Design a protein around this nucleic acid. Structure first.
Ligand SMILES: Nc1ccn([C@H]2C[C@H](O)[C@@H](COP(=O)(O)NP(=O)(O)OP(=O)(O)O)O2)c(=O)n1
Ligand SMILES: [Mn+2]
Ligand SMILES: [Mn+2]
Ligand SMILES: [Mn+2]
Length: 379
DNA sequence: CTGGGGTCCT
DNA sequence: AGGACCC
């Protein structure tokens, strides 16, 4: 029943891409800016006190010589993201993406194949690659330890191929489920890997200082838990199941409590091709609808290129706005438009404008801060 | 001085 | 259509 899972997370991903493009940025402290947000920075900048998701002005205040590069266009990072996923799919076909810079891979089948090839003399020769969490002792007669060590070897080969083939460094964690692999992948950063033997699971889980650090417990759930006197992992572990269900629902309650024990039965799912393609534009003000129409047309031009590139056709379109708290309207895409994928621009513009005005009233003044377009329902 | 994306559930 | 979650 026991699995071997790996989780790979990339070092300062966006910054890493920018440093690959312009090597002049390699040794200077580097931040990647999106409007007023330094969304990540390289490790030289983190030495100087820059943190991820800092304000531009807090960033330059803590580090005035910070070099900033614009990262509002995700094209190059998206390309790199999928190159990493495809490389990992060479190892095992079933690879789960999380965001742009993280992948899970279920190594179980691979581990077993490698050990079936091994003879009894060399089971004694199996060595860890990288760090062992909590420097736990390895017991070579424990088959779980052996399997996780082989998993750590496969993780090292993976990171070495990402570097040799794509020039990318990242951290990996090897553990027995997705949650533990993802928690352990970050223990030694950057560009290192860690493996978690079962006896250390509780240690890893209690090393966290608040429940929001558990993937699956977000802003709102954390708030509700804090209103219940639950702040530590052990608080959640020892809390009443029944009160928890009543407060958050049965699924949320049971899942997050199991998580608080380090238990996670969820499988590694094949992410495959994207389920949707969207673009966003943020701004201080949009009040003229011919302006709004310009913004929109700008968005769609790029999305039409990308949709064409993938070679599938979307069967739904959505328009999203935020007023001076987000709202959307969607509709199907007419079949002749779909088959045309010819001037597909103009019809799509008219459709999206009709949705626009369904949501906002021009006859009245309006203040719009975010305008976004999503193409989903691909086939 | 709070981006620009994604997933699945309800 | 919105909401929760992830990065
Ligand atoms: N809220 C967020 C989180 C991440 N990102 C982008 C920028 C990051 O470089 C990239 C990966 O996210 P991340 O792993 O959380 N941080 P990053 O990889 O930059 O640094 P590490 O701490 O992982 O080395 O996604 C974002 O644009 N908005
Ligand atoms: Mn990440
Ligand atoms: Mn990362
Ligand atoms: Mn969380």
């Amino acid at each position: 029943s026991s699995r071997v899972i790996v989780h790979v997370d990339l070092d300062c991903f966006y910054a890493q891409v920018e440093m690959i493009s312009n090597p002049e940025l390699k040794d200077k402290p580097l931040g990647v800016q999106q409007k007023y947000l330094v969304v990540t920075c390289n490790y030289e900048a983190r030495k100087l006190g820059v943190k991820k998701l800092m304000n531009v002005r807090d960033a330059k205040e803590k580090c005035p010589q910070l070099v900033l590069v614009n990262g509002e266009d995700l094209t190059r990072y998206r390309e790199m993201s999928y190159k990493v996923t495809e490389l990992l799919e060479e190892f095992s076909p079933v690879v789960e993406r999380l965001g742009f810079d993280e992948n899970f891979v279920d190594l179980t089948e691979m581990v077993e194949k490698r050990l079936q090839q091994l003879q009894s003399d060399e089971l004694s020769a199996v060595t860890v690659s990288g760090h062992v969490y909590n420097n736990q002792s390895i017991n070579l007669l424990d088959v779980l330890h052996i399997r996780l060590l082989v998993g750590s070897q496969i993780a090292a080969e993976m990171r070495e191929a990402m570097y040799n083939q794509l020039g990318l460094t990242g951290c990996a964690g090897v553990a027995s489920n997705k949650l533990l692999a993802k928690l352990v992948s970050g223990v030694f950063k950057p560009n290192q890997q860690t493996v978690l033997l079962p006896e250390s699971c509780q240690h890893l889980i209690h090393s966290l200082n608040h429940i929001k650090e558990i993937p699956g417990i977000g802003y709102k759930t954390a708030k509700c838990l804090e209103a219940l006197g639950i702040n530590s992992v052990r608080d959640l572990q020892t809390f009443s199941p029944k009160i928890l269900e009543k407060e958050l629902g049965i699924s949320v309650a049971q899942r997050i409590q199991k998580l608080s024990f380090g238990e996670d039965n969820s499988p590694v799912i094949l992410s495959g091709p994207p389920q949707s393609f969207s673009e966003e534009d943020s701004f201080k003000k949009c009040s003229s609808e011919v302006e709004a129409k310009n913004k929109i047309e700008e968005l769609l031009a790029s999305l039409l290129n990308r949709v064409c590139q993938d070679g599938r056709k979307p069967h739904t379109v959505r328009l999203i706005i935020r007023r001076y708290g987000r709202e959307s309207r969607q509709c199907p895409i007419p079949s002749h438009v779909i088959q045309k994928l010819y001037d597909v621009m103009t019809p799509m513009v008219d459709i999206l404008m009709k949705l626009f005005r369904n949501m906002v009233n021009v006859k009245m003044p309006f203040h719009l801060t975010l305008l976004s377009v999503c193409f989903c329902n691909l086939k």
